[PDB]
Write an enzyme that holds these catalytic residues in place. Structure first.
Site, PDB file in Angstrom:
ATOM      1  N   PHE A  11      -2.481  29.694  20.704  1.00  0.00           N
ATOM      2  CA  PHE A  11      -1.896  29.336  21.983  1.00  0.00           C
ATOM      3  C   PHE A  11      -2.413  30.210  23.086  1.00  0.00           C
ATOM      4  O   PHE A  11      -2.489  31.430  22.950  1.00  0.00           O
ATOM      5  CB  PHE A  11      -0.389  29.559  22.001  1.00  0.00           C
ATOM      6  CG  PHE A  11       0.371  28.755  21.004  1.00  0.00           C
ATOM      7  CD1 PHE A  11       0.767  27.450  21.281  1.00  0.00           C
ATOM      8  CD2 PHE A  11       0.741  29.320  19.799  1.00  0.00           C
ATOM      9  CE1 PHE A  11       1.492  26.730  20.351  1.00  0.00           C
ATOM     10  CE2 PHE A  11       1.467  28.606  18.871  1.00  0.00           C
ATOM     11  CZ  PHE A  11       1.842  27.307  19.147  1.00  0.00           C
ATOM     12  N   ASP A  12      -2.720  29.589  24.201  1.00  0.00           N
ATOM     13  CA  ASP A  12      -2.709  30.322  25.453  1.00  0.00           C
ATOM     14  C   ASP A  12      -1.235  30.659  25.722  1.00  0.00           C
ATOM     15  O   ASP A  12      -0.327  29.907  25.305  1.00  0.00           O
ATOM     16  CB  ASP A  12      -3.164  29.375  26.542  1.00  0.00           C
ATOM     17  CG  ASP A  12      -2.947  30.026  27.896  1.00  0.00           C
ATOM     18  OD1 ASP A  12      -1.987  29.688  28.599  1.00  0.00           O
ATOM     19  OD2 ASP A  12      -3.906  30.928  28.229  1.00  0.00           O
ATOM     20  N   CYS A  13      -0.987  31.760  26.426  1.00  0.00           N
ATOM     21  CA  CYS A  13       0.369  32.091  26.841  1.00  0.00           C
ATOM     22  C   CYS A  13       0.692  31.669  28.281  1.00  0.00           C
ATOM     23  O   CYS A  13       1.559  30.835  28.518  1.00  0.00           O
ATOM     24  CB  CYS A  13       0.604  33.594  26.684  1.00  0.00           C
ATOM     25  SG  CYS A  13       2.281  34.080  27.115  1.00  0.00           S
TER      26      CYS A  13
END
Length: 241
Positions: A11-13
């Site tokens: 995941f990107d945050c």
């Protein structure tokens, strides 16, 4: 073509799990008020995207908490308004208070039961611990720009992740990269031959917000409007598969 085909989600945050657009608007509001409230949210976000991406290329090893103060300065100077170095440094500290999208903690807790969860994020590790606390889940790995010495969309970020996922028993084909940003995440993910899932947080919002316009719109294997919808799709796959 099934979510269950993957052993892990990366995941990107900031923009996918944490609502960095709302967070940076709050962090910038004393500055933007000096310009005037006529300046729209999208204009602010895009001006930040421009200065943030350029500064991340200029000083790739600068911790995010120390890079955002420079972005604040560049914006204040572009808008011609007074500001202070103290305000700049406080803005870099504001990341730890950027809020989670309300669906993120529950979605991540659901997904943890079925996948190893990896973070690939433009952040420093000291800052990210505060976002991690808001997300209320344990990540199997956190690959930050601080670890990498560069910021996405640099090739170095995916290369660094790919160089460490073997320690988790994973190969690149086991991972579905899940992210909001075409510029930061999906263009590089496709360059690296990764399967990708677009969490289209801005599905009802004109333009790219806090991300730069990408060189082209990349392909995506899945798309959902939210993390809650990703979880519902996984539930549907189990129910009807």
């Amino acid at each position: 073509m099934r979510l269950g085909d993957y052993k892990a989600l990366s995941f990107d945050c900031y923009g996918t799990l944490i609502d960095w657009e709302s967070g940076m608007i709050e962090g910038l509001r004393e500055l933007t008020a000096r310009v005037g409230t006529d300046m729209s949210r999208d204009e602010i976000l895009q001006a930040h995207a421009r200065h943030e991406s350029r500064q991340q290329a200029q000083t790739p090893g600068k911790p995010y908490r120390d890079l955002l103060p420079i972005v604040y300065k560049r914006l204040a100077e572009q808008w011609g308004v007074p500001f202070s170095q103290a305000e700049c440094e406080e803005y870099g500290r504001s990341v730890r208070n950027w809020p989670a999208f309300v669906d993120s903690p529950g979605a991540l807790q659901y997904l943890k039961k079925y996948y190893k969860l990896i973070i690939l994020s433009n952040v420093d590790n000291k800052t990210f611990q505060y976002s991690n606390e808001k997300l209320q889940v344990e990540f199997d790995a956190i690959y930050s720009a601080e670890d990498v010495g560069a910021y996405a969309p640099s090739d170095r970020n995916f290369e660094y992740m790919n160089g460490h996922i073997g320690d988790l028993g994973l190969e690149p084909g086991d991972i579905l990269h899940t992210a909001e940003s075409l510029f930061h995440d999906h263009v590089p993910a496709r360059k690296f031959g990764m399967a990708n899932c677009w969490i289209y947080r801005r599905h009802a919002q004109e333009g790219f917000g806090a991300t730069m316009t990408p060189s082209h719109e990349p392909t995506y294997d899945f798309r959902f409007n939210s993390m809650a919808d990703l979880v519902k799709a996984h539930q549907e796959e189990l129910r009807n598969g």
